[PDB]
Ligand binder design. Structure first.
Ligand SMILES: N#Cc1ccc(Nc2ncc(Cc3c(F)cccc3F)o2)cc1Cl
Lengths: 549, 402
C-alpha cells in the first residue's frame, strides 16, 4: 500500500437560524425500490454513503429514473437542503474568453470523475444529507443513508470540488511553469508548447501526482478540437459552434428572441452583425411581422454567416488594436486584433435608451465598454482606431460641460465619420438680428402660442393646439431659427430648452428637437442666451405678453 | 495583543462585492504584496466557505514609485457598527498641516477572529484563467473604519511624549492619515515632522503632504465693474443677480431690467441710469456680507458639487442645505486628461473636508458613470475613497461661479 495524503475537509454550515431538511420520502414501486437498494449497496461498498441509525431527523427524498436501458438510476433531490445551505464563494463566475487564450502546440484533457468522490464531505454536515429507501410493502423500517462525499446536486459540490482540485494542482503547476492547467466540470485542460514527446511525459507526471491523493485518471486512451462553453477550441484557432439562422415563413416572439441570442453570440467573432430591428420587434412568446427593415437586416446576417470565420489567440508580445465603425441607428461594431485581418474577437455596441443623444457621446461609451472588456480578457487597454478626426475630438472635449476621456487612439478614415454638426457661439454676434422668443400653453385646453420679437421689428406669433409649455418653448426657438439669416442671436427664458440644446444632441426622439437640430446645422453662427422669466427683461417681456394671451 | 470585539450592524450581512477588472501590472503588484503579507501573517488564504468579498486594487502614492494595496472597504464601513475621534476646529486654522501615512501601524494589532471572514478579498487573474487568490485579514486592515477606532488607544500613548512637548501642534487622525498642524516656519515644521516619524519608527511612513488653509472659505460672489454695459452684459448680470437672490435677502433687479426696456440688439450699449447704478451698488454691498444662518451640523451629510469651467479650472461648493454653502473653492493646477484632473479635484476637496469637518463629502460629479468608473482608479492616490453620484444634466449655475 502506497500512502495517500488526505483531502482536508471544507467546514460547511447551514444558513443562520435555519435548519436541516425534513421532507417526505415518496412511496415507490417495488421494482424501483429493488433498484435503489442495489445501487446504494454498491455506493456504500465504494464508500460514498453510510447507513445511519434512527436518531437522524433529516430526510431528502430519493427517486429512481429509467435510463432511456433496462438499468435504473438513483436521483437524490436536494432542492430543499440547498435552500438551507450557506452561500459559497464561486470562482467560475467568470469564464475565460477564447480570444484571451494563448496558442498551444499540444493540448490534452484529462477526465476527473473519480477524484470527485475522493473528495470527502464535512463530517458535521453529513447528517443533513439523509435519505430513505422505502421498504418493500412498508413492512420494515426504511433503509437510512447519509453521504460521505460531495453529492451530485448539492449546492456546495461545485465550489468545494474546484477548491480542492486547485490546491492539489497548485504545486505541480508551480513546478511546471512551461504548461497551463485549467479545470471545468470533470475536465482538466493541460496545454504546452513542448514537443509531443515531452508533453505526454508531463501528462504522465501529472497523473502520478494525482495518485498521491489517490486520484485515478484515464489512460492514454481526447485531443483538439474541443467543444467547450459553445466554442470550438483548436491548437491555433477558435470559433463558436456553428451559427445556423433558421428559415421561417412565419416568425414569433420566441423565434425572434432566439434569433437575437444567436446573432449576439455570433457577434463576438462574426464582423458587422446587427440586431437593432429584430431586437426592436421585441419591444415591451405572438407572431410579429418583420418590417422591411428587419428582412434586409436579416438578409445581411445570413450573408455574413454564409461561411465560417476564425479568430486567433492572444500573443502577449504584440500590441492590441481595436477598431470601431458607425453602423447607423445608434449601432456600433468593433474588431480587436494584433495583425491586420486576423481578429481575436469582434463585438458591437448599442446606443443607451435616452431622449436625445449624439454620435461623439456614443463613440465614447463604446470605447469605454471595449476598454473594460479588454482589461478583463487581456489585462490591458488596446490602441484605438476611431472614425473621428483629432480636431473634432479636441473641439468636443474642450467645450463639453462634462469631463470626458478616451485612451490612446488614432484617426482611421473609413466613412461614415463622426463629426460635430453645429457649434454655438460663446459671445453675442455683432450685426446679427436678435430674436426674443417665447411660448406658453394653457394646461387645461392644451392651447398655447409660440413666437418671437426682434430688434428689427420682425415679429411672429403662431397659435397651437394640443401642446405644453415645454413644447411651445421649443417651437418659439424653432420659429426664430426658421425666420432668421445665417447668423442670429436668440434670447429665451426657457431653462428647459437650454438644458436640451446645451447637451448638444445631433438626433432626438422629439421631431421638434430634430427640426431645431436641422436648422442649427444650416446656420453659420448661433448665439443662444438665457434670461430669467417674468423679470421685465426687454423683448422677453414684450413677447411673453404676446404668447401668454 | 488582545483583540477588540467587533460586529456588524443588527440584521446586516457581510459584504458581497464583486471584484472589478485589474490590469496585468496591478495584478502583479498585488501578487507580490500579498505573498509577503501572508508570509508576515497579516493575511491568510481562505476557502469557498467564505462568501463575502470586497474589491481590491493598486495605487501609487504621490512622489513614490512603489505600488500600494488599497481595499475599497466602502461597503464594509457602512455595515460596520458605529464605534464609541472628535474633530479639532483648530486644525483648519494652522498656517500649515502635513499629512502622514500611518496606516502601517495597524498591521501590528490582531483582528477579532470572528470578524476576519468579513475582510475577504480576491486577487483576480487575467481572463479568469486561474482561480482568484482569496485572502482575509488577521490584523487591522488599512481603510477599514474600525482600524483607527481600535488603534485609538495605542496611538494616544505613542504621541503623549510629543504632544506634551509641543502643546501648540494640533494632531488629528482620519483613516490611515495623521494630520499634524503647525504655525511655525516650514523648516522648523519639516523637522518636527521628522521628529514625529521617530516615535513611530521607535515604537515601530517617510512621505509628507503639505497643506495650508485657503483665505475666504466661501469665495464671494462678485459682479463686473464696467464703464459700458451692452444688453447682453446686463442680461447676464440680471441672471446672476436673480440666482444670487436665492442665497442673499435683499437682492433687487427692478432698476436693471428697467434698462432692458424694448427689443434691443444684444451688442448695443446701454448707459446705466442713476437708479440702475444705485441698485447695482446696494447689491454689491449685500454680497460682501456672509450668508445668514449657515451652520455645520455633524449629523447630516456633506455634499460637494464640481463644475468643469475649462482650461484646467474647476469650481466646487460644499454644502448640506441648498444655498447654504459652508465652503466654495476653485482649482486650476494633466492639461489634456479631463478625468485625471477631476480625480485630483475630488481628492483635494476630500482632503479639505477632512481638515474642516473630520468627514468626507458625497460628490456630484460632472461625468458619465461609465467613463468615471473606467478611469478614476488610474489617478487615485489617497488611502480613503469618498462616495459619489453623477450629474447628467448641465447645470445652468456653472456660469454663476466663473
Ligand atoms: N485546442 C486548443 C487550445 C489551444 C490553446 C489553449 N491555450 C490556453 N491558454 C490558457 C489556457 C487554459 C484554458 C484552457 F486550456 C481551456 C479553457 C480555458 C482556459 F483558460 O489554454 C488552450 C486550448 Cl484547450
Amino acid at each position: 500500500m502506497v500512502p495517500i495524503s488526505p483531502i482536508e475537509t471544507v467546514p460547511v454550515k447551514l444558513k443562520p437560524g435555519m435548519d436541516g431538511p425534513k421532507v417526505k420520502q415518496w412511496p415507490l414501486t417495488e421494482e424501483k425500490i429493488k433498484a435503489l437498494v442495489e445501487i446504494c449497496t454498491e455506493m456504500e461498498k465504494e464508500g460514498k454513503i453510510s447507513k445511519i441509525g434512527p436518531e437522524n431527523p433529516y430526510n431528502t427524498p430519493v427517486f429512481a429514473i429509467k435510463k432511456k436501458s433496462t438499468k435504473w438510476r438513483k436521483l437524490v433531490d436536494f432542492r430543499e437542503l440547498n435552500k438551507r445551505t450557506q452561500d459559497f464563494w464561486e470562482v467560475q463566475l467568470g469564464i475565460p474568453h477564447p480570444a484571451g487564450l494563448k496558442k498551444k502546440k499540444s493540448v490534452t484533457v484529462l477526465d476527473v470523475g473519480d477524484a470527485y468522490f475522493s473528495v470527502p464531505l464535512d463530517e458535521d454536515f453529513r447528517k443533513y444529507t439523509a435519505f430513505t429507501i422505502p421498504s418493500i410493502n412498508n413492512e420494515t423500517p426504511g433503509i437510512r443513508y447519509q453521504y460521505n462525499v460531495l453529492p451530485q446536486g448539492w449546492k456546495g459540490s461545485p465550489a468545494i470540488f474546484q477548491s480542492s482540485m486547485t490546491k492539489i494542482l497548485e504545486p505541480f503547476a508551480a513546478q511546471n511553469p512551461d504548461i497551463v492547467i485549467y479545470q471545468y466540470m470533470d475536465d482538466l485542460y493541460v496545454g504546452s508548447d513542448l514537443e509531443i514527446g515531452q508533453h505526454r511525459t508531463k501528462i504522465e507526471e501529472l497523473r502520478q501526482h494525482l495518485l498521491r491523493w489517490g486520484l485515478t485518471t484515464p489512460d492514454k486512451k481526447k485531443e483538439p478540437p474541443f467543444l467547450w462553453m459553445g466554442y470550438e477550441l483548436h491548437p491555433d484557432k477558435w470559433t463558436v459552434q456553428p451559427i445556423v439562422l433558421p428559415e421561417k415563413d412565419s416568425w414569433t416572439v420566441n423565434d425572434i428572441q432566439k434569433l437575437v441570442g444567436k446573432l449576439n453570440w455570433a457577434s463576438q467573432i462574426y464582423p458587422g452583425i446587427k440586431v437593432r430591428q429584430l431586437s426592436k420587434l421585441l419591444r415591451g412568446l405572438e407572431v410579429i411581422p418583420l418590417t422591411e427593415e428587419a428582412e434586409l437586416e436579416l438578409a445581411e446576417n445570413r450573408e455574413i454567416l454564409k461561411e465560417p470565420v476564425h479568430g486567433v489567440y492572444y500573443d502577449p508580445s504584440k500590441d492590441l488594436i481595436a477598431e470601431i465603425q458607425k453602423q447607423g441607428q445608434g449601432q456600433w461594431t468593433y474588431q480587436i486584433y494584433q495583425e491586420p485581418f486576423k481578429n481575436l474577437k469582434t463585438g458591437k455596441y448599442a446606443r443607451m435608451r435616452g431622449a436625445h443623444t449624439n454620435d461623439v457621446k456614443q463613440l465614447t461609451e463604446a470605447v469605454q465598454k471595449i476598454t473594460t472588456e479588454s482589461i478583463v480578457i487581456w489585462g490591458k487597454t488596446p490602441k484605438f482606431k476611431l472614425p473621428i478626426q483629432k480636431e473634432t475630438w479636441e473641439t468636443w472635449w474642450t467645450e463639453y460641460w462634462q469631463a470626458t476621456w478616451i485612451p490612446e487612439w488614432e484617426f482611421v478614415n473609413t466613412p461614415p465619420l463622426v463629426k460635430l454638426w453645429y457649434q454655438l457661439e460663446k459671445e453675442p454676434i455683432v450685426g446679427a438680428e436678435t430674436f426674443y422668443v417665447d411660448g406658453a400653453a394653457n394646461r387645461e385646453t392644451k392651447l398655447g402660442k409660440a413666437g418671437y420679437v426682434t430688434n428689427k421689428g420682425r415679429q411672429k406669433v403662431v397659435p397651437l393646439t394640443n401642446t405644453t409649455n415645454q413644447k411651445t418653448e421649443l417651437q418659439a426657438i424653432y420659429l426664430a431659427l426658421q425666420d432668421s439669416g445665417l447668423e442670429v442671436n436668440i434670447v429665451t427664458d426657457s431653462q428647459y430648452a437650454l438644458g436640451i440644446i446645451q447637451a448638444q444632441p445631433d438626433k432626438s426622439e422629439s421631431e421638434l428637437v430634430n427640426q431645431i437640430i436641422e436648422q442649427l446645422i444650416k446656420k453659420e453662427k448661433v448665439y443662444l442666451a438665457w434670461v430669467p422669466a417674468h423679470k421685465g427683461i426687454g423683448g422677453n417681456e414684450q413677447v411673453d405678453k404676446l404668447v401668454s394671451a | 495583543i488582545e483583540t477588540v470585539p467587533v460586529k456588524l450592524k443588527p440584521g446586516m450581512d457581510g459584504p458581497k462585492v464583486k471584484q472589478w477588472p485589474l490590469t496585468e501590472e496591478k495584478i502583479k503588484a498585488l501578487v507580490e504584496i500579498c505573498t509577503e503579507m501572508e508570509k508576515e501573517g497579516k493575511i491568510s488564504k481562505i476557502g469557498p466557505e467564505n462568501p463575502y468579498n470586497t474589491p481590491v486594487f493598486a495605487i501609487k502614492k504621490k512622489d513614490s514609485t512603489k505600488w500600494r494595496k488599497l481595499v475599497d472597504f466602502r461597503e464594509l464601513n457602512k455595515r460596520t457598527q458605529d464605534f464609541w475621534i472628535p474633530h479639532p476646529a483648530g486644525l483648519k486654522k494652522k498656517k500649515s498641516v502635513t499629512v502622514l501615512d500611518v496606516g502601517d501601524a495597524y498591521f501590528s494589532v490582531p483582528l477579532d477572529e470572528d470578524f476576519r471572514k468579513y475582510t475577504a478579498f480576491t486577487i483576480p487573474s487575467i481572463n479568469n484563467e486561474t482561480p482568484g487568490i482569496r485572502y482575509q485579514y488577521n490584523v487591522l486592515p488599512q481603510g477599514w473604519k474600525g482600524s483607527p477606532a481600535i488603534f485609538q488607544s495605542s496611538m494616544t500613548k505613542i504621541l503623549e511624549p510629543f504632544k506634551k512637548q509641543n502643546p501648540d501642534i494640533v494632531i488629528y487622525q482620519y483613516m490611515d492619515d495623521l494630520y499634524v498642524g503647525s504655525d511655525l516656519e516650514i523648516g522648523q515644521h519639516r523637522t518636527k515632522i521628522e521628529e514625529l516619524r521617530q516615535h513611530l519608527l521607535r515604537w515601530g511612513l517617510w512621505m509628507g503632504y503639505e497643506l495650508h488653509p485657503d483665505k475666504w472659505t466661501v469665495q464671494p460672489i462678485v459682479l463686473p465693474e464696467k464703464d459700458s454695459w451692452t444688453v447682453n452684459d446686463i442680461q447676464k448680470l440680471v441672471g446672476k443677480l436673480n440666482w444670487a437672490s436665492q442665497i442673499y435677502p435683499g437682492i433687487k433687479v427692478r432698476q436693471l431690467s428697467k434698462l432692458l426696456r424694448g427689443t434691443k440688439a444684444l451688442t448695443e450699449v446701454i448707459p446705466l441710469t442713476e437708479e440702475a447704478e444705485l441698485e447695482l451698488a446696494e447689491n454689491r454691498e449685500i454680497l460682501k456680507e456672509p450668508v445668514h444662518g449657515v451652520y455645520y451640523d455633524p449629523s447630516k451629510d456633506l455634499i460637494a458639487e464640481i463644475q468643469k469651467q475649462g482650461q484646467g479650472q474647476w469650481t466646487y461648493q460644499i454644502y448640506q442645505e441648498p444655498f447654504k454653502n459652508l465652503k466654495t473653492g476653485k482649482y486650476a493646477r494633466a492639461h489634456t486628461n479631463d478625468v485625471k484632473q477631476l480625480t485630483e479635484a475630488v481628492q483635494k476637496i476630500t482632503t479639505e473636508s477632512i481638515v474642516i469637518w473630520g468627514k468626507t463629502p458625497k460628490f456630484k460629479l460632472p461625468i458619465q458613470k461609465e467613463t468615471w468608473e473606467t478611469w478614476w482608479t488610474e489617478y487615485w492616490q489617497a488611502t480613503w475613497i469618498p462616495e459619489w453620484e453623477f450629474v447628467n444634466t448641465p447645470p445652468l449655475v456653472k456660469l454663476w461661479y466663473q
